[PDB]
Design a protein around this nucleic acid. Sequence first.
RNA 1: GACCGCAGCAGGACUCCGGGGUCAGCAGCCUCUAGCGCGGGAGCGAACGCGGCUCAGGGAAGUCGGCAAGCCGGCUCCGUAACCUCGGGAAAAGGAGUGGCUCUGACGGCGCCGGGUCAGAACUGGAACGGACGCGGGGAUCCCGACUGUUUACUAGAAAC
RNA 2: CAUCCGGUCGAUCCUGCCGGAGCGCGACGCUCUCCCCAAGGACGAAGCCAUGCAUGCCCGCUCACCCGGGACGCGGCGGACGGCUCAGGACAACGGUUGCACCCCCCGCGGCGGUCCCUGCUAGCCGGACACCGCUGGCAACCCGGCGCCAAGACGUGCGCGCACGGGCGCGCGCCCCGCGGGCGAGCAGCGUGACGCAGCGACGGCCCGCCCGGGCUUCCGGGGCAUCACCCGGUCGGCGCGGUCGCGGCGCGCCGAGGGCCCGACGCCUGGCGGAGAAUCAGGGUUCGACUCCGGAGAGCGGGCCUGCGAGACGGCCCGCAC
Lengths: 97, 147, 134, 163
Amino acid sequence: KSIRGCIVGPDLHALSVVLVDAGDKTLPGLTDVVVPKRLVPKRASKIRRLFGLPTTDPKDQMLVCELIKELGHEVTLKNGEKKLKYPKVQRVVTDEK
Amino acid sequence: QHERAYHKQSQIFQGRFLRKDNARCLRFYKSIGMGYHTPITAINGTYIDKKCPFTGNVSIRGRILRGVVHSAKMQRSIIVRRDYLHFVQKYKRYERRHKHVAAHLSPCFRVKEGDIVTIGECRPLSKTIRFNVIKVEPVSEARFSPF
Amino acid sequence: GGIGNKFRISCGLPVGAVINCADNSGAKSLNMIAVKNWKGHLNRFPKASVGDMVLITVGRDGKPELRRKVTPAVVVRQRKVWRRKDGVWIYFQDNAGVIINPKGELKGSSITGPVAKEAADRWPKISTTAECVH
Amino acid sequence: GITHDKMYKRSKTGAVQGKWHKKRKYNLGRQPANTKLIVKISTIRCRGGNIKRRALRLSHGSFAWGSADISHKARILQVVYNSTSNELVRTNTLVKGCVVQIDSAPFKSALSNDTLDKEILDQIRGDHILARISSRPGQVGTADGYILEGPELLFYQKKLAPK
RNA sequence: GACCGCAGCAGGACUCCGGGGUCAGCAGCCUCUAGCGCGGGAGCGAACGCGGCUCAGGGAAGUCGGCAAGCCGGCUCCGUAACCUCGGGAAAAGGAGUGGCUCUGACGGCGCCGGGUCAGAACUGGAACGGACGCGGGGAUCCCGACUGUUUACUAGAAAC
RNA sequence: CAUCCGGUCGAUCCUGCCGGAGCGCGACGCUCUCCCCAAGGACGAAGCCAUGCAUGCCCGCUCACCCGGGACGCGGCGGACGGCUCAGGACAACGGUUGCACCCCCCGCGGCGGUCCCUGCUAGCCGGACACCGCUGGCAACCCGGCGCCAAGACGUGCGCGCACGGGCGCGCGCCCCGCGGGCGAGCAGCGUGACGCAGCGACGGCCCGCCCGGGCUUCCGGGGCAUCACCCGGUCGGCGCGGUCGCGGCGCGCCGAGGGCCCGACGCCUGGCGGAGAAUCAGGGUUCGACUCCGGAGAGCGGGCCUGCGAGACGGCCCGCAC
């Protein structure tokens, strides 16, 4: 395929940049806003680490939930029937495991 | 020493000639199957041959055919002339027909042109040599013979 | 059929020049019979530059139909260095030309190698057909 | 596109053969990996997906002295006598049957030992025990060999002779 | 070096002897020995001339006509057609290599000492090697004379004799 | 499934062809009342192609919509079979007959399963992270850029019987041979013991060996015409050492010889040449055709080169030159 060069040029009609260290003035769109992470850890060793189980046996129910009912239920008006939107916990030791 | 490389039989380890003058085996006289006797020329001979039918690392697997020696002019190899009759059906008659087979003549037997030899199938040992001489039936000092 | 007022560039191909084919028309080599728009002076061989329509004959190398006829052509590459008014002095490895009618249509579907901007500006079909303008 | 097909060759009578098929992948050959000797083992995926090891540069190998039954890793100091190409000797390429000088230091202890011949014990002092490589490094990925013993040595000493 | 042509005239004059290097060479180029500094010198660096060079892009379009110039060239290995009196054509046409080093091989007399030719290989150098010099451009046809020879000293070397 | 008859003469008997008469397989003409079966762009155009369609399925993992169904994604398996055509190819393919003690193989099926040290390991159990996606995008199109969230039976690690254990490397029968095996017509396998190497695979443990099927080569025999093609070849023919391969071998490369093939027709040339099982016709002996239905070969405009793969030198993969 045709690929543009590593060295920057006048030709590029678009460029991309990662702000690292910055000036005091907060960027009008960047420094003020804080994006919520869409989802959370599901790997159990990460989930135990997130709750500092190593810091302070299989946790099993330490898992959090979006708690936002069920996807594909708004038209059914099943909004009151709030399922726990637990991200499925994976890497969790079970007694079967 | 004009030979670019030394030649050693693979079966016998080089430190047998150096010492142990008393005993052990310094040559490998394997006996061929199919009721053919490894000759004493191989048993007491000094030749090496990687493709020798008896001493060398070759196996006689496949058919065994007999033919006269058309030529003995290559190095340790002969061409065996095969004479056979092919029957054409429409004419109730046969055709005398000939095919030439390239075979490896190991130094153990001695072959002069015009002598019956038995050739046995072997792993291809050359572009044209897929057969190794097993026996030589010498003929008189001097036709079409189907063997 | 040339579109525009070209600025004068040094002409490296006089009558007698055998320019190479730049098209799949089937000619391999084209001999320059003469130059169009030429009022000469006594003894001056007619001379041509890149982007200039010339009358050419195709030699024994070419396909038979192309041979034996005076055919219009444009020079698309010249070995002689020439100075564009921008100050660039440019030359190409070979002298080559495209068989084209005076109207502008070309005999061959394809053009091979770089083609000078002078040819491509003057003749639009040259610009579209040629892979590179240099 | 290196191939080991017989279709490209001539017939026994010297008659040009006609080509019936296009090159096949089963009938393929690979660029020879002449194994240089330093003074990396590449992995290649073969037919069946079997992985054969190709040594490209290999410093030392498990050489051995059979009559004295002592076998130790030793460093390959230098390559002498290729027997196929003199060019390979001076490029120090490693092939089977390649005479080589291994460092005498792993086998140095046997110098005190006696009765394991006399000529081979003289080599122990010099730092130059002659040894033929026994393994194809291109196919087996190893340069394990065997010290020359008895008449083979005498032939390879006469070949290496300063003349 | 004094002869004979006007002359102490780049004209013409018969022999003998004939080193080195590069080379196939008594060739070209450079030299040892020996000879030796030519109807003068200075200045300048115009045109034009004569003797040589080099030239972009094109490539005989110049001209009566490729005249003159250029191209080619030594060696080694391949590779060579029509035609033909079978002898030729033919160096046909057309290619490729070539240096300097460092080494290998072969070739004799026969304790031991030649020879300088032939191959083969590394490794090197702006992509360079017959490095100057010397040194076929080639091909397709037509006419005429078979050829090698001879010819109008001083305008015709030809197909003429 | 043993048959003739018309024609040279003025007549006759011959030779000899010409012509009929039968049966197929296709074209054309004219004509077809109905049903059953059935061939159907092969025929010196393997010429070119608009458009549509011909390879998906699956849920290992599932925090948009809808519910237990998950889309999208990642992952797996398959896409190498099938369908198509007969261009190329004349000791080739192809047929019948051998071998691989010279070999590769997915699946499935049956066995078998011990995995070194040593540092650092977590073995109730490891990382960090990619796509989809959230944001922010260029580009005519094709194509895809960044930044963050975050899973696997994905990825990389990884404890684990010093009878630990992959490859390869040594030393391990002979007394003229053959008359036992783990075995074989065959000295083959396996192991012991040296040393090398740390190969496996272990995060839902499985390498490995077998059998199968499918290869790859291979042995013998059969395998078009043309002499207005008589000599031919020069890795060509053998040896030897290496390399390469799944392996074998001039298969490649050095080296060393001078072979090798042929009037039993070699070699050259040519083909409107795929071969076989078969098809047509048909006392017998034969002649002709071997597009196509099954089997084996070959190819995807024409050459090359590869990648992924267990397998493709694959073209409803890629890359390049060529032709359009």
